[PDB]
Each structure stands twice: as C-alpha cells, then as structure tokens.
Amino acid sequence: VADHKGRVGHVSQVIGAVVDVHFADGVPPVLTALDVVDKLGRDEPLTLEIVQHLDAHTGRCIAMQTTDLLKLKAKVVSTGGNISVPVGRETLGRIFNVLGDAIDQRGPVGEKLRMPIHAVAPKLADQAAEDAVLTTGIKVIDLILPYCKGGKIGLFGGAGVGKTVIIMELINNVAKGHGGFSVFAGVGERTREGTDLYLEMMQSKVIDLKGESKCVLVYGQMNEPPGARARVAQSALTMAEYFRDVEGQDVLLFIDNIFRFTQANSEVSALLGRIPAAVGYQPTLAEDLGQLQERITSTTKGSITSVQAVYVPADDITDPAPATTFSHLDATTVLDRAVAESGIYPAVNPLECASRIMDPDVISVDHYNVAQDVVQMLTKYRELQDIIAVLGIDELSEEDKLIVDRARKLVKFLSQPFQVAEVFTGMTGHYVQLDDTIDSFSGLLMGTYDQVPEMAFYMVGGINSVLEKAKKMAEEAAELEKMRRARV
Amino acid sequence: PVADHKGRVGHVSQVIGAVVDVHFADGVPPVLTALDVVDKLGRDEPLTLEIVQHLDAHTGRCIAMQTTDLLKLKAKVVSTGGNISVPVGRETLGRIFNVLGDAIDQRGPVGEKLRMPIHAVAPKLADQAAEDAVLTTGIKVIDLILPYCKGGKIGLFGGAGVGKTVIIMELINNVAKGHGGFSVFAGVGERTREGTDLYLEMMQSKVIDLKGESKCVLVYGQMNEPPGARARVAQSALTMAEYFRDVEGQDVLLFIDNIFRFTQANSEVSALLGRIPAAVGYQPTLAEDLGQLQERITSTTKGSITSVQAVYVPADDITDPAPATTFSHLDATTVLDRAVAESGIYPAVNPLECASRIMDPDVIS
C-alpha cells in the first residue's frame, strides 16, 4: 500500500464541493489526487484532493471542478501523488490554472518536470539576511513605509479603495524593468482584470510569444469553485519556489487577492464538518496562512519579493483574516475609504502603516529622520483635528495653526497621480525619485515652502512640480483679475 | 368536495411547550392542516393544533393555539379536513373573533353561511389592477399631501396621545360612507385593556351598531394567547377582508395593530421549532413571512384591500430588520406627533414628515 497509483474507490457522499470516497484497499495518503473515472454526462474532468481521513477506508476530499452530475458509488482512481504543476523556464509566457493545465490555447508546454503544489517551507538555517530598499516610485510608499527587496509586502484595503491600481502601478514601475522573473497569482479576482494584464504584458513585450518571456500567470478566479480558489495560491507559489531555488533567480510574486484564499478554506471548512471559530472562519485560519506565508520567503539560494493584496470585509481591519496577516508581512500598507472619498489617491493611511526597514542601519539617516518627522506631525494633526471638528480652527493656539497648515500641505502632498490611473485622474502620471521625495518633504517641514498655496501640492510629483503648478495657478489668477478689471 | 384526511385519527407522540408531535397511522395530513384534541383531559378550553412540519411519513409537528397543559401522550387527535376555517360573510359585521373564528363577544351564534381557510395564495400577476387609483378618505390632510393608494399599505406611525383611535374610527366611517366598503380590525399582540376600550368606543360612535347595521369586524389575538395564535390572527382577519374583496367586489379597509407584533410572534414560533435565528435574532423567514401576508393585500380586478398598519420601531432604530423589511412593503406613511396635537391641530399629522408614492402626475391629476 506504499504506492497507490491506480487504487480504486467509490464515491460515498457529496455534500457540495466536498466528496467522501471509500477505498476498500485503504484510503490513499492525505493531499493525494484522485480522478473521477466514471463518465456521467459531464463536460469537464473531476479531480478530488484528499483533505482528511475519516477511517481506514474512507476519506474526505475537495473537488477542483464542479461536482455536478456526480452520483454515489462512482468510480474514483488514485493518481499516485499530489497535485503537480509544470515548472521550469518553459512555463514562462504562459497562463495556467490550479491543476497546471495551460488555458492560453497556444500549445503544449513541454515542461521537463512537474512538481507537487504542497511542499515544506524553508528551515531556519536557510533564511536570508539581506535588507535593501525596493524603490517603487510612489512618494508615500518610498518615504514612510519603504518596501524591502525580498520582503513580504501587504496592501490592506476595502472594496474599491485602490488595491488593484497600486499593484498595477508597482508592476509597471518595477516588474517591467525587473531583470528576474515574475509570477502573477490571481485568486478570486475578476476575470477581466486577468485579461487586461495578459494584453498589457504582451504590449510591453514582457510576454513575447515569438521570443523570450519572463512572466507566468496562474489564475483561479471568482467563477472557480471554492476548491480551486484555495489551491491556486499553492500552485503559483510552487513555480516561484522553483525559480528561487533551482535557478537562484530573483522572483516577483504578485498575489491578488490573498483574502480569497482564506475565504475559500472557510467555505470548505463549513462543509467538512468543523466547528467555526469567531465570525465564522475555520479554526485553522492561522495555520493555513502560516504554512502558505512561510513558503513565501527569500532563502540563501534566491530571493522572492512578494506583494499581496488583502481585502478587508466591511472595512473591519480587525476581521480574523486580515488581522492574522499583519504578522506575516515585512511592509504593510493600509488604505482607508474616507481618505479616498476626500480625493486623495493613493488612500494610504500613514499612521496605520509600518515597515521593517524603517531603521537608520538600513535606510539613510536623513531618510529616517524625515520620515519620522512627517509621521510625528501627521500624529499632531490628528489630535488637533479632534478639537477642530467641534469648535473650529479659530479656537487653536498661534503655533497650532502653523502645525495645521503644514500638516494639511503634507496630506495634500502625499497624493500622487499614477501612470495607470490617467483615465480616472485625467492627468499624466509621475515617477518621483527617492532622493527627490526626501529633499522635498524636508523643506516642507522646515517651512521653506510656507508661502506656496495649499492646492499646489495636490496631485503632483516632486517639489519642482509643486513650484510649477503654483506658477500656473498664479498666472490663471491673472485671467481672473485682468478679466475682472476688464469687466469693471 | 371533501379532503381525504378529514376525520383521520392520530396519537400525540411528543409534547414540549407549545410544540406537539402527532403520529397518524394512515399518514400525516398536509402541512398547515388543523387538528383537534378529542381527548377530554379535564381542560377548560379545547386544544387545536396546526401542522407546520413533517418529521416522517407518519409523524407531524404542530403548534398549539391554546395552552398545552394536562395534555398526556397517546391522546387522540382528529383532523378537521383542512386548514383553520374562519367564518366569512355579512353576518360577521359588528362581531369579535379569535384565530379560530369563534365569537368571543358572548352575543349569540354567528350563524355564518360559509367558511374559508386561513391560508390562501396571493392574487396572481394576472389579477392585479390595471392602474393605480386614489382612495378618497375624506380627510383634507391625507387626501392632499399623502393620498392613499387603493390596495396599498399605509404605515401609521405614532403612539398613544395623538388620536390614533379616532383617526382609525373616522377612516372606517368615511370609507363605508363614500366607497361603501367594510373594515376589519386585527389586534395582534394587543393589550386586552386597550381592546376593550376600542370596542366600547366603536359602540359609542355606532361603527358597531348592535341594534342596527355595523361596518366593522374585530379579530383579537391578544398578548395572553400563545405565540401560535398571535401569528395567525392577522391572516384570519385578512381572510375575512378577502371575502368582501372578491365575492362582493368592495374596497375594504384592513387595520393591523401592530405589524411588529406579527413579526415578533412569528419569530417566537420559529424559535420554538429550533430554527437558527438570523441577524439581530429574528427568524430566517422574516422576509417570506411578511411577504406571504402583505402580498395578499392588493387591488385586484374585482375589488381592493387598502391596509393601515401601525408600525413600531424597536429601540428607535429605523435600520432594524423588522421595520426595515416592513418599509419595503409600505406604499404610504402617516406620522402622528404629540407636538402637533398639543398645538390644537386635529388630526395631529406632520405634513412634512409623511410620504406617499402615488404623489406623481402619472397617477394623480
């Protein structure tokens, strides 16, 4: 019974996407894949992955396709191993699903090997100790919550707050120019977004079907059943590990959205017959994330820079899924709906953001000192804003008003038009260098730019852009005063 | 015609609170069927049960309309041959009834000529009125600012101290005076003190003329009754109104006081059966339960039934599921304020706080 290739069982219960299978020769090992051989008028294959052992013969499993037209006492055959995915440089420039099958309707992959989706995470001795700054080109991200090369990054946000836009901006700024390889994992996201990304990559020739490509696209979207959405992340992560280890190549792993992974496990758990935890998530919420996140790390062989989008249901950042994810992130970026409603994009809430490389030993001393000063004033303004709400601005001290004015300029300044949101913003995108941001924010704190109008900092790049929008605003005032004189 | 399950005998299998399981050898009757506990038991009132669920091909779970005290196991139960039957006709005018359609007024036999089942399917889509029409109540405020919709639901927000009783009585008198239609009042979870006061007042205004012709029926499922009764009294009153709407083609007025107690009663019944409550703690079938009631209140091609339901907002939270679900079925809103009453304005109606959907040129002139 050591090898179970071809072992025959029969369906015994179908609760939904959860199917029990009885093998009379012994239930195959857990995480083993099984194929429903019996043809029952279906249009697609049915593969069930074992998730539990109920007895010496029975085993509960989750289906990676729909369980329609499946009857009890239907023949199931073991595949002889876990679900496996193609890996190698042949996968580059291709679209895959959870099962490793190509969905781009182009041709055979021709991979030299297939590797299992489920694998052990790197050990302590294999962890890396390199700390650098991944310059994104976004002022708020670069200054206050700098991203770390080879470090986990999380974008917490609500519905329609800007998670996807930021990821696309990062892909344009970093991934396209990245020498190493990239893997885009789509988990419970719109299928249209995947289509746009594939076309965008081919235009930038990051996916040269007639040449050499540098991006793999693994997609299991909302339409897919809960079983597929749970395992799609493992499949995509499997390819990234291969590039990191077997080739020692830098990898960029863009996961959108990691929350759906936890949701999918929750949906199946309710069917598996588990007592729910708080809110209704599965009791193994923490364990599932830990196993998945621990594999997303940079070892002594290679480096994986992972950017993961996190969805916060009903804007409850204390929700068990997003709340557990914070501990598994080097960099955190929290987006707030109220900030977006005020016209500030990106809607990053700097006070609730944090970074691991916000350390003078890593970033420049000036960078650390300026970043700390900005957050200190953004903390003062929040306290002052509580007084301002009820009484008013005029009920503040003379120096308090100065702090309010500087803080308001800082808040406006943090906004930036992205090159991907030109349609929404109607303005050309900006790419602010790290040095320019540091020097520009230093002056605003010093008070050197206390004579510039407030709205000159809104939707701009560096301080050069600030001082040009101010000029245009002043000139436009001459078309409102000269016209006034003409009218008078 | 007669249903085969009439006279079917069964035995009380299980008793818990107001829930009783009855075993029938020949097969459980259809759901919603009414059964009578023939066993004597030395009780003071007869015990009626209503099948709500089928546990197996022979066992059925029912809710008792009266107290289930002194009910032993194996007690004989006989089916009545159908759902609860309520008398309908012109003989019920000026009379008080309960869920079972029994005259609780001690004023002689009803002498009805026909009875109807409590549970009746709502009018089909083909029976809906061709066009919306206004209901002339005869009141200047209502007819002008918040006109009533024939076959619509009107939420009469306001408590005691604003003249709600007089407005109700005035509407009952005006509708008969102008449109020649009758009225049915349904006290769901009503304080028995206030129910007595209404009957005495209606006799003084002669909307209930004991020596003459009355123009109002009363159906009182007061608080003291178990939840199984407070969840069906409204349907019984609705059945009486439906008779006048269809057989006579009138434009009836159905008052329900309150509609929140109907939600509360049906919530308690669901809890007794063991169903998992939804958010806040109401029954999972909250939307369906109201729908099966409100949808039966509409203007058909034969007549119409315009309902004036008194709405209570729990904890003054307008987003609570009960009032929130109720508002989705209200066609008009009539708000009564004490401040207006204290100023000497009667009826005490806040014109700017009321609303109506037929306030559109496409409907009114």
Binding site: - | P1, D4, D26, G27
Partner: protein, 50 residues
C-alpha cells in the same frame, strides 16, 4: 397492469432471467386507473380528483 409490467420487464435487459412477480399496493391518491413501478421505471395510467 400485468401486461404493462411484462412489457417493462421485457425492456429491461438486466432483468432477463428474473421472474416477474406482481405486488399490489393501494395508492390513496389515485381515483381511477393504475400505475406500475419496476426496477425504478414508473408508468402512470391513472388520474386524480378533477
């Protein structure tokens, strides 16, 4: 009913060697006619209260 049962038996190949026994049941609903159920196959030639 016997003729219908025999015809149904003939159609079923898997019951080739099985012998057809007939068991009568009183279906309370049907008012006129009959029905035949054999190895899942069900033919109704009955009516109910019109």
């Amino acid at each position: 009913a016997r003729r219908v049962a025999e015809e149904l038996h003939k159609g079923l190949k898997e019951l080739a060697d099985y012998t057809l026994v007939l068991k009568t049941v009183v279906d309370r609903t049907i008012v006129k006619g009959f029905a035949v159920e054999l190895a899942g196959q069900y033919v109704n030639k009955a009516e109910g209260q019109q």
